[PDB]
Design a protein around this ligand. Structure first.
Ligand SMILES: Nc1ncnc2c1ncn2[C@@H]1O[C@H](COP(=O)(O)OP(=O)(O)NP(=O)(O)O)[C@@H](O)[C@H]1O
Ligand SMILES: Nc1ncnc2c1ncn2[C@@H]1O[C@H](COP(=O)(O)OP(=O)(O)NP(=O)(O)O)[C@@H](O)[C@H]1O
Lengths: 663, 285, 663, 285
């Protein structure tokens, strides 16, 4: 069992994109290996008997030892044609349903392999059906629909409200917020690292409060290091850094008592940097002005010369007072005052009546409406010594400041390490504190796919909601792999569904989770359909072609259709497909009742529904998941809750039982 | 029922009397605008909900007023307010609810919830009086703080204006009680806490006393005495303990303590006085 | 002939909010008069026999001459209770369905009027059914759903792509882009002003090209005037202003020939400002540095004194060259160069081999590794005259610059007027050019509601489409007031609908429109429902209670339901209601076919549908509106366009005719 | 059919010959990637679409090859490319279409559209010789500019990369022709334009000539001569006009003109030469 395999590859100056093909079977995949060893490992793996390359390929070192090589022209690897070509092959108007739409580096390779295949085979090839992506970050990942829809870091309207962030992010520092938000975009699936995080997160719960405020002192050390590296760093940035360095002995002490070797490792990563603290302490005032431009930054006592040039301008005011007083009493003019002007320098002003009663030492620099100003050599002498000393003290200050960049940069990587460590600790501690604040539990990992939730809760909705969340369990497995969910509106369909999503993600950053007890097997891929028609359908197919035996599939109201039957038919299928062939762990939210016949029709499918207690003027939504199926029409009831006038509600129910009197 | 603190304290203890382990307490605006109590104590059936508040509706119904001594406290509140009771019984039922005058079902766990807008709704003045905003919470904050040390077995969450303020976890039976002691009285007290365990016959004295040697101006604010659960501020005990702080070290400064006494019914009798005294002094040495 | 009316009002320091009530009928409205005369006119109009006010009302002058006054407490006007109260009165969870949800200033007034009414009547009042907003700008009303949905200035993903703006905004200046985008947010409905704009827009089409580039020179004059007013304006901002002022004689000439008195009026508003040009021209260099801080801004020839202090530092380089040259000659050391240092001042450096071959005039200031630097008295005293003169020249420069703010500000309003005129002209010309570029037509206004389109086109989609749009007409009136639209997906339902919207808006800014000929009567309000359940319903009711006999109602796929009949019933009603009672000009996009029985059921309703031509195993979408109704299920067909595997498509069609074999 | 400029010019004139008043011409990437021609000239029936490109399919069909002299130009392009014809006839019909693998109906107005992607599906070099593209558009820009002055009755929109570049409006018959003259030749020529109207028997000369007195380096780039529509390559007329610019003012610098001549044939015959000359000189004075 070693096959006849074909491949194509093209590169831009960014990285690589790759595609393959077997003429015996008709198999077609894509990828975008970013670096060299990955690209070499991908040719090694697939091992094409025949390999395509564009004339101008740069990293030839990969392919010149390989067999059955095929030099091709450039124009054949153009995305425009490539996309156009392959789209009419599969027949679609886009490659949305394939899950590769914006991966063009790979698509030139798929595009050139098809023009070659058209021309290698030159007959119809309908044993080539599709194309799918394998995924760079294989601690596997979550589509764009899920992301925009789950609002983990951004909501409906585009703010940060009702977010998983809004809850979890009570991180004290901005570098905590980012890394907290990043771990959400990229869940960790090396089992080892997940458990490292749980051990750390649990051991901190006794020290939640003691540590928190210490980190709020730091500020964004990370971004400060940036302007340091760029050499655009400003005084008050270096100031909050110093304040951060002063917390290091404190944190070193508090963490040494904590029982977790991963904590002891991160405690080292933090570091101390005693000498770096010392320099900043000796060089700079407590909190100087905003920029360095107009000085006032370096403290006296760091540099002798600094204080020297400062002593020239410090012989200023008393010099001019003695002048003002001597000259006032020598001339006999009391309106005589020695003042400064930005424009002209210093001067001696006398009021107009007394002005021509002044001595002949005085040289006119400035006539006024109400006075005459004069200059004298003693002042004009002294004018210089001040103005210049200022400049050169200022100049020394600029010099000393930018020299500090030279002094810190040799440890620049060691500081980034500490900055990364501290950012991560804020995240860990915040989470230790969110499990302390909101009572989350520590889960465990199992062998094969399955989720068990014991009285779990939607971690966002419960915090925003009037009443406490109606906690529900969930029990899924390879034996019980699908749940047909029917019921009333505001029944909690989409809620019971999307809540499930949050459980996984949370467990898979090593954090504790909103439930009594949670056990979980492998779940690689997390796909979603988000209500609204071109649009609706297209994404559905993606989830089909890519989702696996171990994935999580998230369906709500597919078949917002053009007719009675389309919707139903459509659905009927997709469900049977996920139970019959794919065998993934699925949750299927629907309104089209006939599907509830599927637990009997299929092995592995079982009925559930959010039961409603519908009574008189009002109606009750248990917000509880019940074994069985939905009753009936719940829309007519919900109608008024919008604000429907009864002109309509009664025309609705008057027609409803014209219709419901047939069935 | 004059302050929000008083309406809080009583309706917090209605659930305690119903055997409660979890109590959510939520406020907005010093108590003026919102007060929300949720409990896991046993519930109120759909018959008992209506007439506990609505007063000629009692006439025909055959003394079912019986089940509900909170019903006494509720009735007074309800005539001149915007009250909302909602509850599902421990007995397999659906949840039922009372507003403002509608009774209908809604949804809820095993227990009871009470939602309210500023109690007096047609009394011009008694509202106009209702003290500040800030201070009313600071009083409520104490109400919970008192009942908290009285009951280590009930989890209480106090929040203000949507935001969590105080989270008192119930300590497991036979558990680490130092957790809850630091949460209520700050960390400063916790680290100077010298426990006490004295016992003569029927009488039994348990608790903590801050070491006088390291008792500072911040710590001196903690003086609470409970007897079989109930705090009385009877001046007798004032002596017993200020005698005890004088007798270890002569400097008579303000002490820090929280003590628990367990005896058989005898409201206040000198027996109790010297019992207290001897317990504390041994502990300080 | 006359009434019995009740009212309530409250104010914050921002403005007023107002509410009313008649106990005979039970009528309940809202408003937020912003200023005093509007508030006085609103009490004058409604003329309550009984009027409520909170103890602490500030503008008492409005109410102390009025009859049947009622002083009320403050707490009764609190929004929290008010909202809570009124919500349980109507029974809803929110006031979304009333179209007043975010108008809280008015709602305190409505809130207090209900606690009073509860207590004035204490009797049954279900003759009080609803609340609705009248809108200050009788000129316009387009709801939030329409706005976020129509993507006139912003698309779904949050960019500016596929927008009406992306097309129309070929405006040359940023102040054009804004005002262009603003007129879209607020369509003009004084018929006079609309026709003024058409006359202007048509007369410019010969001068499209000639004018365009002249305006791109201006830049954002408007925002420059801002930092001028704030006194934060910078050199290069004043520079682009000057460049703008130089175009004014040019524009004055080009527009004098154009035939439109509205153009001649706007030509005056532009102005000239000859003296203001003169000052900037004489005071500033062509393009100075970024800020004024480090000088080099004011040109020589503006100020004698400026050039005086510049003459001291102007005797710099030549002074030091003659020194460098004389001393190089005199000593015989050619590596001798006279240089400057920020730290130490000027010096004379010689290379190490030649260093001890220098004369004894030289005083050591600075030893180096590979040279020796020296100072001499000639240099050290010349050092001063430069460094100080610089400063005082710099100081004069700062003074002169901020004084210019004093000189321009007396015309500040006249300049804003020109800035507004120019911004508006770019918009007008841009639109004159978009009608020139995209061949739009000039419409006319009629008496009573109705739209007639002759071969009209969706102005966005046709530009993003690689093809000309399938232009279609439209014919609506008070007689033909509703169109039931059924058909295939990608039929162009939502397209034929949303296109209608754009026509109105465009016509109602006085611009030409994408069609052969367009005539239109009054349309006040423009409401919309945007595919995706709690969500979908609530907004529906709004449109009901607010929409009028003259409005435009925009329905697409209402009744994405929980069951067979709910959706249908629901819709059935809404339609009948808009035809039977409201009588608005409507377009109803649906997928529930039974509704197509409504042309027979109602007067004023007529069937239309987007017809599709299915040939074998491909399908054609005519993109053309046909009289009659839809065929069938078009979803099974669209399925594959996603990329559906045939495991499923054939299970679909295998079940489809199990279902379709009953009906 | 070597350059994109050539394929453009020919297929632009296919529609003119079909009596066209509106012509859309759209390009991307120097012509390499995209070329789109839409016309309002008469259309192509559903029978005539197939065999104009596909070549044994002509045999059985009874000389309907007749209607389609563009069909000659199309056939050569089609065998080695990615072509898309689509058209609805002025007569009895729905729109029909041909691609790349399919004939089916789609939609279109009265006329014809032609869409295309880069030719040579397996020829390595002949593509290498398509120019640096920038220049290819600058050539196409001239193609349209030439045919534009030849036909004042046809509206032409030239665009590049989706974006409008040039819009030549058709002047109403007996209308203001100064509007189109400025659009094609810039405003500089327009304002120096001195019209010409000369007439001897069968021969008739109409047009414009930039005043030599105010003819600058920018203006001298405009020299185009048409005879009953058609621009020829004849050195003769060079003399007639450089004789005319020399004879008004001696300074023999490069002129600016666009002239229209209407006769019965004298292909190059001296008759035509002095007729031209005398027309221009009178106009300059
Ligand atoms: N288990 C629960 N406990 C408490 N509240 C809940 C629960 N489930 C849902 N809710 C609330 O009910 C609201 C609506 O529920 P949702 O899941 O959106 O209904 P649905 O069945 O998807 N139908 P619709 O939303 O109308 O299409 C949400 O805003 C939740 O805040
Ligand atoms: N008159 C037209 N001319 C050309 N293209 C059109 C026309 N109308 C619609 N389209 C295109 O057809 C598609 C359908 O538009 P739309 O109105 O959203 O369809 P729909 O009937 O609402 N069903 P769906 O889009 O599946 O929900 C879009 O891709 C448009 O670009």
């Amino acid at each position: 069992r070693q096959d006849n395999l074909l491949a194509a590859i093209w590169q831009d100056s960014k990285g690589f994109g790759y595609a393959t093909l077997d003429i015996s079977s008709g198999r077609f995949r894509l990828s975008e290996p970013a670096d060299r060893e990955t690209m070499a490992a991908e040719l090694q793996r697939t091992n094409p008997a025949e390999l395509l390359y564009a004339e101008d390929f740069a990293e030839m070192s990969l392919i010149e030892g390989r067999r059955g090589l095929r030099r091709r022209p450039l124009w054949e690897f153009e995305i425009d044609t490539a996309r156009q070509q392959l789209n009419l092959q599969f027949g679609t108007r886009d490659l949305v349903g394939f899950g590769v739409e914006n991966a063009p580096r790979g698509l030139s390779a798929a595009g050139a392999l098809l023009q070659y295949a058209k021309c290698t085979q030159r007959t119809t090839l309908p044993h080539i059906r599709s194309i799918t992506m394998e995924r760079e970050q294989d601690s596997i990942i979550m589509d764009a629909a899920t992301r925009r829809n789950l609002e983990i870091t951004q909501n409906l309207a585009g703010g940060a409200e009702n977010t998983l962030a809004s809850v979890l992010d009570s991180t004290v520092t901005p570098m905590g917020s980012r890394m907290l938000k990043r771990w959400l975009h990229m869940p960790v699936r090396d089992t080892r690292v997940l458990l490292e995080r749980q051990q750390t997160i649990g051991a901190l719960q006794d020290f939640t409060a003691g540590l928190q405020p210490v980190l709020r002192q730091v500020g964004d050390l990370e971004r400060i290091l940036a302007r340091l590296a760029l050499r655009t760093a400003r005084p008050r940035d270096l100031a909050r850094m110093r304040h951060a360095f002063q917390q290091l002995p404190e944190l070193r002490a508090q963490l040494e008592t904590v029982d977790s070797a991963p904590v002891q490792a991160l405690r080292e990563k933090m570091g101390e940097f005693a000498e770096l603290r010392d320099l900043l302490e000796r060089a700079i005032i407590d909190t100087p002005p905003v920029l360095v431009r107009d000085g006032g930054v370096i403290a006296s006592g760091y540099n002798e010369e600094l204080d020297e040039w400062r002593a020239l301008a410090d012989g200023a005011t008393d010099y001019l007072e003695r002048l003002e007083v001597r000259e006032r009493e020598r001339t006999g003019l009391d309106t005589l005052k020695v003042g400064f002007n930005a424009v002209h320098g210093y001067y001696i002003q006398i009021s107009r009546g007394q002005s021509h009663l002044a001595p002949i030492n005085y040289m006119r620099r400035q006539t006024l409406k109400n006075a005459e100003r004069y200059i004298i050599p003693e002042l004009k002498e002294y004018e210089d010594k001040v103005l210049t000393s200022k400049g050169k003290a200022l100049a020394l200050e600029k010099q000393l400041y930018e020299e500090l960049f030279d002094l810190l940069l040799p440890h620049l990587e060691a500081l980034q390490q500490s900055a990364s460590a501290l950012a991560e600790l804020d995240v860990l501690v915040n989470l230790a504190e969110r499990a302390y604040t909101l009572n989350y539990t520590s889960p465990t990992f199992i062998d094969k796919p399955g989720i068990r939730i014991t009285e779990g809760r939607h971690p966002v909705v419960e915090q925003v909601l009037n009443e406490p969340f109606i906690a529900n369990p969930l029990n899924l497995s390879p034996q019980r792999r699908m749940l047909i969910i029917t019921g009333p509106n505001m029944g909690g369909k989409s809620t019971y569904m999307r809540q499930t999503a949050l459980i996984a993600l949370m467990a898979y950053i090593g954090s504790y989770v909103p439930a009594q007890k949670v056990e979980i097997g492998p779940i690689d891929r997390i796909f979603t359909r988000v209500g609204a028609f071109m649009v609706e359908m297209t994404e559905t197919a993606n989830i089909l072609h890519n989702a696996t035996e171990y994935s999580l599939v998230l369906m709500d109201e597919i078949g917002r259709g053009t007719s009675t039957y389309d919707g139903l038919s459509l659905a009927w299928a997709v469900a049977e497909n996920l139970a019959n062939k794919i065998k993934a762990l699925t949750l299927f939210a629907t309104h089209y009742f006939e599907l509830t016949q599927l637990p009997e029709k299929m092995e592995g499918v079982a009925n559930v529904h959010l039961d409603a207690l519908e009574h008189g003027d009002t109606i009750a939504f248990m917000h509880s998941v019940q074994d069985g199926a939905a009753s009936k029409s719940y829309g007519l009831a919900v109608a008024a809750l919008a604000g429907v006038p009864k002109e309509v509600i009664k025309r609705a129910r008057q027609k409803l039982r014209e219709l419901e009197s047939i069935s | 029922v004059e302050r929000p603190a008083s309406v809080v304290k009583e309706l917090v203890e209605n659930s305690l009397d119903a055997g409660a382990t979890r109590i959510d307490i939520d406020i907005e605006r010093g108590g003026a605008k919102l007060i929300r109590i949720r409990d896991n104590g046993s519930g109120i059936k759909k018959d008992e909900l209506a007439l506990a508040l609505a007063i000629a509706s009692l006439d025909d119904l055959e003394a079912i007023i019986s089940l509900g001594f909170r019903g006494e406290a509720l009735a007074s509140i309800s005539s001149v307010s915007r009250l909302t009771l909602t509850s599902r019984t421990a007995e397999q039922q659906e949840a039922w609810q009372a507003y403002a005058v509608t009774v209908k079902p809604a949804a809820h766990p095993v227990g009871t919830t009470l939602e309210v807008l500023d109690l007096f709704y047609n009394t011009p003045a008694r509202r106009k009086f209702l003290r500040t905003e800030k201070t009313e919470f600071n009083h409520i904050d104490e109400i919970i703080r008192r009942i908290a040390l009285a009951r280590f077995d009930v989890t209480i969450n106090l929040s203000h204006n949507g935001k969590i303020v105080r989270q008192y976890r119930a300590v497991p039976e036979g558990g680490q009680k130092e957790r809850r002691l630091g949460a209520i009285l700050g960390t400063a007290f916790l680290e100077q806490a010298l426990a006490i365990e004295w016992q003569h016959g029927d009488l039994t004295l348990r608790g903590w006393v801050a070491d006088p040697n390291h008792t500072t101006p911040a710590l001196a604010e903690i003086q609470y005495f409970y007897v079989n659960g109930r705090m009385m501020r009877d001046r007798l005990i004032n002596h017993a303990i200020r005698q005890a702080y004088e007798d270890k070290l002569g400097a008579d400064q303000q002490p820090a303590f929280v003590l628990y006494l367990e005896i058989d019914p005898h409201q206040v009798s000198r027996l109790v006085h010297d019992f207290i005294y001897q317990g504390v002094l041994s502990v300080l040495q």
